[PDB]
Amino acid sequence: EPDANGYYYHDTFEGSVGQWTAAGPAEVLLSGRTAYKGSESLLVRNRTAAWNGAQRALNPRTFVPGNTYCFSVVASFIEGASSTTFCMKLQYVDGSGTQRYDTIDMKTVGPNQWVHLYNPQYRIPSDATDMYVYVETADDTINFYIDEAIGAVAGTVIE
Numbered sequence: 001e002p003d004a005n006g007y008y009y010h011d012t013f014e015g016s017v018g019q020w021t022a023a024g025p026a027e028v029l030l031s032g033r034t035a036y037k038g039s040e041s042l043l044v045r046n047r048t049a050a051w052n053g054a055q056r057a058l059n060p061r062t063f064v065p066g067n068t069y070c071f072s073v074v075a076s077f078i079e080g081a082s083s084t085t086f087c088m089k090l091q092y093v094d095g096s097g098t099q100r101y102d103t104i105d106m107k108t109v110g111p112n113q114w115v116h117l118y119n120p121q122y123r124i125p126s127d128a129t130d131m132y133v134y135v136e137t138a139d140d141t142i143n144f145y146i147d148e149a150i151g152a153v154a155g156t157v158i159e
Protein backbone atom coordinates (compact mmCIF):
# COMPACT_ATOMS: atom_id res chain seq x y z
CA GLU A 1 0.00 0.00 0.00
CA PRO A 2 2.89 2.51 0.36
CA ASP A 3 4.46 4.13 -2.71
CA ALA A 4 7.72 3.05 -4.39
CA ASN A 5 9.85 4.77 -1.78
CA GLY A 6 7.82 3.23 1.04
CA TYR A 7 6.06 6.54 1.69
CA TYR A 8 2.43 6.48 2.86
CA TYR A 9 2.22 10.27 2.70
CA HIS A 10 4.64 12.85 1.37
CA ASP A 11 3.67 16.51 1.64
CA THR A 12 5.84 18.97 -0.32
CA PHE A 13 3.41 21.83 0.18
CA GLU A 14 3.90 22.77 -3.47
CA GLY A 15 0.44 24.07 -4.31
CA SER A 16 -1.40 22.00 -1.71
CA VAL A 17 -1.79 21.73 2.08
CA GLY A 18 -2.65 18.05 1.82
CA GLN A 19 -4.47 16.79 4.91
CA TRP A 20 -2.73 19.34 7.12
CA THR A 21 -4.83 21.60 9.33
CA ALA A 22 -4.30 23.95 12.23
CA ALA A 23 -4.47 23.07 15.93
CA GLY A 24 -5.87 25.76 18.22
CA PRO A 25 -6.91 29.22 17.00
CA ALA A 26 -3.95 29.11 14.67
CA GLU A 27 -3.92 29.10 10.92
CA VAL A 28 -1.90 27.06 8.44
CA LEU A 29 -1.40 28.16 4.84
CA LEU A 30 1.01 27.69 1.97
CA SER A 31 3.86 30.20 1.94
CA GLY A 32 6.66 31.09 -0.44
CA ARG A 33 8.57 33.04 2.16
CA THR A 34 10.89 30.08 2.77
CA ALA A 35 11.20 26.49 1.58
CA TYR A 36 13.34 23.48 2.22
CA LYS A 37 12.53 21.88 -1.08
CA GLY A 38 10.55 23.45 -3.90
CA SER A 39 9.21 26.97 -3.66
CA GLU A 40 6.97 26.56 -0.64
CA SER A 41 6.49 25.27 2.86
CA LEU A 42 3.52 25.28 5.22
CA LEU A 43 3.29 28.34 7.44
CA VAL A 44 1.82 28.06 10.91
CA ARG A 45 0.70 31.37 12.41
CA ASN A 46 -1.68 33.18 14.77
CA ARG A 47 -0.56 30.93 17.58
CA THR A 48 -1.52 32.22 21.05
CA ALA A 49 -0.33 29.19 22.99
CA ALA A 50 2.64 26.83 22.69
CA TRP A 51 0.38 23.82 22.27
CA ASN A 52 -0.96 25.41 19.07
CA GLY A 53 0.48 24.12 15.81
CA ALA A 54 -0.16 21.96 12.77
CA GLN A 55 -1.70 18.50 12.66
CA ARG A 56 -2.65 15.75 10.22
CA ALA A 57 -5.02 12.82 10.80
CA LEU A 58 -3.61 9.33 10.37
CA ASN A 59 -5.76 6.66 8.73
CA PRO A 60 -6.04 3.64 11.04
CA ARG A 61 -6.02 1.36 7.95
CA THR A 62 -2.62 2.66 6.94
CA PHE A 63 -1.06 3.38 10.32
CA VAL A 64 -1.99 0.31 12.37
CA PRO A 65 -1.84 0.89 16.13
CA GLY A 66 0.73 -1.38 17.81
CA ASN A 67 3.07 -1.13 14.85
CA THR A 68 6.17 0.87 14.11
CA TYR A 69 6.43 3.60 11.45
CA CYS A 70 8.76 6.31 10.21
CA PHE A 71 7.77 9.96 10.53
CA SER A 72 9.72 12.92 9.33
CA VAL A 73 9.28 16.64 8.81
CA VAL A 74 11.62 19.58 8.55
CA ALA A 75 10.95 22.77 10.43
CA SER A 76 12.30 26.27 10.86
CA PHE A 77 11.27 29.75 11.96
CA ILE A 78 12.42 33.23 10.98
CA GLU A 79 11.70 35.49 13.92
CA GLY A 80 10.06 35.86 17.29
CA ALA A 81 12.72 34.17 19.40
CA SER A 82 16.46 33.44 19.60
CA SER A 83 15.75 29.71 19.53
CA THR A 84 12.92 27.25 19.82
CA THR A 85 12.20 23.60 20.45
CA PHE A 86 10.04 21.87 17.85
CA CYS A 87 8.04 18.84 18.92
CA MET A 88 6.53 16.30 16.58
CA LYS A 89 4.04 14.20 18.52
CA LEU A 90 1.32 11.64 18.21
CA GLN A 91 -1.97 13.00 19.44
CA TYR A 92 -4.36 10.15 19.94
CA VAL A 93 -7.21 8.73 21.97
CA ASP A 94 -6.43 5.93 24.41
CA GLY A 95 -8.33 2.85 25.53
CA SER A 96 -10.19 4.86 28.15
CA GLY A 97 -11.48 7.50 25.71
CA THR A 98 -9.02 10.12 26.94
CA GLN A 99 -6.83 12.12 24.57
CA ARG A 100 -3.08 11.75 25.00
CA TYR A 101 0.15 12.97 23.39
CA ASP A 102 3.22 10.86 22.75
CA THR A 103 6.46 12.43 21.58
CA ILE A 104 7.87 11.19 18.29
CA ASP A 105 10.87 13.51 18.07
CA MET A 106 11.99 16.95 19.16
CA LYS A 107 14.73 19.33 18.01
CA THR A 108 16.10 22.65 19.20
CA VAL A 109 17.31 25.18 16.60
CA GLY A 110 18.00 28.86 16.02
CA PRO A 111 16.39 31.22 13.50
CA ASN A 112 16.62 30.73 9.73
CA GLN A 113 17.76 27.12 9.88
CA TRP A 114 15.99 23.94 8.88
CA VAL A 115 16.05 21.17 11.45
CA HIS A 116 15.08 17.55 10.89
CA LEU A 117 12.33 16.05 13.10
CA TYR A 118 12.77 12.39 12.56
CA ASN A 119 12.05 8.92 13.96
CA PRO A 120 12.29 5.88 11.66
CA GLN A 121 11.12 3.54 14.40
CA TYR A 122 8.19 5.09 16.26
CA ARG A 123 5.73 2.62 17.79
CA ILE A 124 2.09 3.70 17.80
CA PRO A 125 0.42 2.64 21.06
CA SER A 126 -1.88 -0.35 20.60
CA ASP A 127 -4.88 1.40 22.17
CA ALA A 128 -4.61 4.44 19.92
CA THR A 129 -7.62 5.79 18.00
CA ASP A 130 -8.33 9.15 16.33
CA MET A 131 -4.64 9.61 15.71
CA TYR A 132 -3.07 12.84 14.51
CA VAL A 133 0.58 13.62 13.90
CA TYR A 134 1.07 16.94 15.65
CA VAL A 135 3.74 19.61 15.24
CA GLU A 136 4.25 22.44 17.73
CA THR A 137 6.98 24.24 19.69
CA ALA A 138 7.65 23.61 23.34
CA ASP A 139 7.41 27.06 24.91
CA ASP A 140 6.53 29.97 22.60
CA THR A 141 4.09 31.23 19.97
CA ILE A 142 6.23 32.21 17.01
CA ASN A 143 5.23 31.68 13.41
CA PHE A 144 6.99 28.63 11.99
CA TYR A 145 7.25 26.65 8.76
CA ILE A 146 7.28 22.96 7.93
CA ASP A 147 8.08 21.13 4.74
CA GLU A 148 8.60 17.61 3.48
CA ALA A 149 6.28 15.94 6.00
CA ILE A 150 6.51 12.20 5.47
CA GLY A 151 4.93 9.10 6.99
CA ALA A 152 6.50 5.82 5.89
CA VAL A 153 7.23 2.15 6.58
CA ALA A 154 9.35 1.51 9.68
CA GLY A 155 13.08 2.00 9.14
CA THR A 156 12.60 4.19 6.06
CA VAL A 157 15.73 6.23 5.51
CA ILE A 158 15.27 9.96 5.10
CA GLU A 159 18.42 12.06 4.85
Ligand SMILES: [Ca+2]
Binds near residue numbers: 012013014038039147
Ligand atom coordinates in the same frame (compact mmCIF):
# COMPACT_ATOMS: atom_id res chain seq x y z
CA1 LIG B 1 8.21 22.36 -0.24
